[PDB]
Each structure stands twice: as structure tokens, then as C-alpha cells.
């Protein structure tokens, strides 16, 4: 009955893993050689990455 | 390492090795994949 005014702190811990961002047009693994890796945009040109 | 596969080319997933209800234990009969 004497509970203080309390606020929720949220977080997560995700050990042992690497934050994978796949270079795929739908972020899915449809093969080891992805569809954007075979795309003619990235295969016939040079692009900067920032 | 790879699920079973038929070859009609096209490459078709084979239904062998799947789990079923059996009156007798399935390891002494088949390989279950």
C-alpha cells in the first residue's frame, strides 16, 4: 500500500551474436549470393559507402 | 546438413525421413531426418 512512485526502465542484453544486416532487397536469406549482390547497379559500378 | 531432395532440371524437396505416428519405434525401422 506504500509503494513509491516508480518508473519503468527497459533494456535488452543479446550476447554472443553479431548484428546482421543482410545486403538483400527484402532482408531475407534466399541464397548465399544475394539478389542485390547480383544486381546490375552494384555489379557494373563503383559506389562509396558511408 | 541438407534436407532430402528429389531431382525431376528442377530441385524438389523429398518428404522422406519426416516424423509419423508409428505403432513401433521409428529408429529401429528408418532413419528420421
Amino acid at each position: 500500500k506504500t509503494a513509491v512512485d516508480s518508473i519503468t526502465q527497459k533494456k535488452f542484453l543479446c550476447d554472443r551474436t553479431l548484428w546482421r544486416i543482410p545486403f538483400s532487397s527484402n532482408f531475407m536469406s534466399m541464397g548465399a549470393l544475394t539478389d542485390l549482390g547480383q544486381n546490375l547497379l552494384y555489379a557494373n559500378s563503383a559506389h562509396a559507402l558511408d | 546438413p541438407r534436407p532430402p531432395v528429389e531431382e525431376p532440371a528442377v530441385e524438389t524437396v523429398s518428404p522422406e525421413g519426416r516424423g509419423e505416428k508409428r505403432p513401433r519405434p521409428d529408429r529401429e525401422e528408418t532413419l528420421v531426418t
Binding site: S29, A32, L33, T34 | P1, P4, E7
Partner: peptide, 29 residues
């Protein structure tokens, strides 16, 4: 032929699957 190098389950040589010849695994690919 190379089918006499396989164990005979019955009278048939137990040949391995054609799908087990190469590896395809990568780090999520």
C-alpha cells in the same frame, strides 16, 4: 562404375545421395 565400393543393403549397393557432394554453408548465407 565405383558401385562395388559401397556396402550392400540387400543385393543393391547403398549409394549415397547426390545432394551430399558439395558444401554450401556460410555465415548466414
Amino acid at each position: 562404375n565405383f558401385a562395388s565400393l559401397a556396402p550392400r543393403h540387400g543385393s543393391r549397393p547403398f549409394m549415397g545421395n547426390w545432394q551430399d557432394i558439395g558444401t554450401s554453408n556460410m555465415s548466414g548465407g
